[PDB]
């Protein structure tokens, strides 16, 4: 055919609309995952509960994805206790959630029981929780569920301002998981494992390297 | 109805309406559970609260000859300046004013309803979210930090400087809220 | 509708799109009423505001041969670092880039609105709650405190460094919001 | 609802009811946005306004022993002579009169409704067209020129000459209007 | 009914088989994405081409996901040039790929043309490449495609051993993109942008924090 006589424009707009396509470019992105939280450490001297900040950057794998978004909203967050001790082991594991950073960490059973999301279990009970981490059946699992309803959209951070008014911390920290041992062993030990079954929604992308 | 949630309707004395003989500034009251002993005793057992009502009624107890009036309004931003005069009060949310000796008819508001002849200052509670219950306020902090725990402040002012400081009536709070996540009363801050 | 809630749709010049001949950093604009003189005149009369739209359209006014592009995106966390380059921009929310000379078709967005071949950067307003109207930003504080008042920041970047500092266009904001509890404009901070 | 139009409901302190110890003449107040600081701050952002409500409530703050009463009426023509006495006031539009110490019951009118025992002077707003918003009034001009910008004047009078000038109560404006064509607040005259 | 008389076992095995469930737990995970590579910098003094290592850690968003896997295999890797200059701009952009770290970087057109994946374009041609980044239509785009067939499974790294024998570098570096300017402007400038349209397969998960 005839060679086409192209008309050359002074320019030609180069335009892109919206976050460049890829795995985490959608306005929002829902994510469900099982994440090892920590060892159930049993102090032999302290009766104080151990605290765990329920925020994305504390979940290595989830964090990898979460740092690509600026906002997140927890939908599930459930911590399962997996026993790794015989049925001869005395003691109990106590768990509850603290929804205000300003609130004091429970130092004993009574305090723990009076706190939201409270749960206790024979340190050797709950192995069936292993099946929770995969399929389901929380029938015989030791789980501490965090109240996620009513939790709004939180900014995704890579840190927690700890030496700051608890009120500013609250703006980023939906809740803290408080884990306590009902008794003091003669020597520190680790009766089981704590795995988190988190479900959240990420929103509004951001270059990971900028996210803090 | 359930699962970390139950409504609470209460009535409690808030404070005496004090008229300064020298200052024209408005007195400010933080609308949070810990400023109401009984309500506090309940709210402290929960981690989060959400005001559904919060109304402050002025009930007079002076002679029909006392001059001056009471002015009330709500401040929803800690950073906002406290009204120094009538015009300023009149321009802010929930503004209400009434002769200092009027308002006794609003006592049935304390039990029952009919705010028909009451002197009430209602706080805008719709669209007020869940706030963490606290045992105090960080007064030396950025107002924005305070706003996190303080839904609003009630600003009360006297339209007149009496010859001597005096209290013509009292303020009663009629609050209605919902509490959420259980917490040991002694550990609530 | 009503009851301490006034809806508002405005259009205002936001700022000049400035291109630095030395810095590759983006310029950020705080998406809050006090940054728009006319809108501020209105918003300062209220304690609370809630953005419903907030769109910033770029209107060019340079030769079609000028080199470079304008890049825009929104930052929803004050803690988040300001983009220093195209990828950082292309990777974040509301990203949009267009040749610096392109855009005039966007004037229709201003009057009326038929955004087609318009260069707009829309902010995520859904799920943005009632914020407190302020007259400033506490930059000297924890970014989390700032977040309390800053729904988002618009990030505008020049895809390239002109040999001389210049401004090839202007940014106009098309905001839609609802205002809530009245305050004396002079006491609103 | 839209395209250069949104309703505005406001409440603001208008002025102190001042009783002259020597003059029997009525004091006059121009019912225009610029005489209400906050409302002005809003209205000035628009070129045209149209009053939908405009009610002025008298709220007393004196002893039940003060004698005399307040008289109010509206004047819809700048050329019209200001009422010198009770009969004259009583014969003009919106006329209302009440003992100077009565009216506190009308405070709920400021927030909510029920003008049931209020002392309100309502301006006839139906059939009041769009008027240009102004920052002032040409007082030395033909009344007809003034009528162009002045929907009406509120005439307030004391049915008695107290021994000394005094202010028994205050006047609060409860205005409701619609604004129309945007304008830079600083350029509005 | 009758209370069930539970039989208490000496223990109860706590077992989990396979990487804990979540977004990046599958043995393999395929990922396609558009990633801004860099500015097409035009030196006014050097004629040397600029090199870009075609490896995951150089793609911020992709890297977020890629660091959760230990092995990767490029399937596509295409670099698109987007012009941001008028049709009055003189010069050309030259691109090619170097598949051996030991190979010398081309210093001129002839050298560039003799190299695999070679491509040149009027610096003001190729705006239609914008549509490539989203839908498709590479009909009028300036693209430099990397030979991915025959590229095996490479270990995912967070760095490149640069002061090491090019042969060891080759074990981790599938290829380098060489970008050159056909001419020297009177002063350094940036005629356009380089975006990468990568496609790869990730395999064998690993805690991100361990991945280096
Ligand atoms: Ca962040
Ligand atoms: Ca608390
Ligand atoms: Ca304010
Ligand atoms: Ca005017
Ligand atoms: Ca590795």
From TrEMBL, chains A, E:
Q: Which Pfam families match?
A: Viral_coat
Q: Where is the Icosahedral viral capsid protein S domain?
A: 48-207
Localization per Swiss-Prot or TrEMBL: Virion
Protein's UniProt keywords contain ATP-binding: no
Matches recorded under SUPFAM superfamilies: Positive stranded ssRNA viruses
What UniProt keywords apply to this chain's record, in alphabetical order? Answer: Calcium, Capsid protein, Metal-binding, T=3 icosahedral capsid protein, Virion
Keyword flag RNA-binding: no
Chain positions recorded as Ca(2+) binding sites: 100, 103, 156, 211-212
Q: Name one GO molecular function term.
A: metal ion binding
> GO cellular component terms?
T=3 icosahedral viral capsid
- Protein family per UniProt: Belongs to the icosahedral plant coat protein family.
Q: What is this protein called?
A: Capsid protein
* Species annotation: Rice yellow mottle virus
């Amino acid at each position: 055919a005839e060679p086409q006589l192209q008309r050359a424009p002074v320019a030609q707009a180069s335009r892109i609309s919206g976050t460049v396509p890829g795995p985490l470019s959608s306005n929002t992105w829902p994510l469900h995952s099982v994440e090892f939280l920590a060892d159930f450490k049993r102090s032999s001297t302290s009766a104080d509960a151990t605290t765990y900040d329920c925020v994305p950057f504390n979940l290595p794998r989830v964090w990898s994805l979460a740092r690509c978004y600026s906002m997140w909203k927890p939908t599930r967050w459930d911590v399962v206790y997996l026993p790794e001790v015989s049925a001869t082991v005395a003691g109990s594991i106590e768990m509850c959630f603290l929804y205000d950073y300003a609130d004091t960490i429970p130092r004993y059973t009574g305090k723990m029981s009076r706190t939201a999301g409270f749960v206790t279990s024979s340190v050797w009970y709950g192995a069936e929780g292993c099946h929770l981490l995969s399929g389901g059946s929380a029938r015989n699992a030791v789980v501490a569920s965090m109240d996620c309803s009513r939790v709004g959209w939180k900014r995704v951070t890579s840190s927690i301002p700890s030496s700051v008014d608890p009120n500013v911390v609250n703006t980023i920290l939906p809740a803290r998981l408080a884990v306590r041992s009902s008794i003091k062993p003669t020597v520190s030990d680790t009766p089981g494992k704590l795995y988190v079954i988190a479900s959240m929604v990420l929103r509004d992308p951001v270059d990971p390297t900028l996210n803090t």
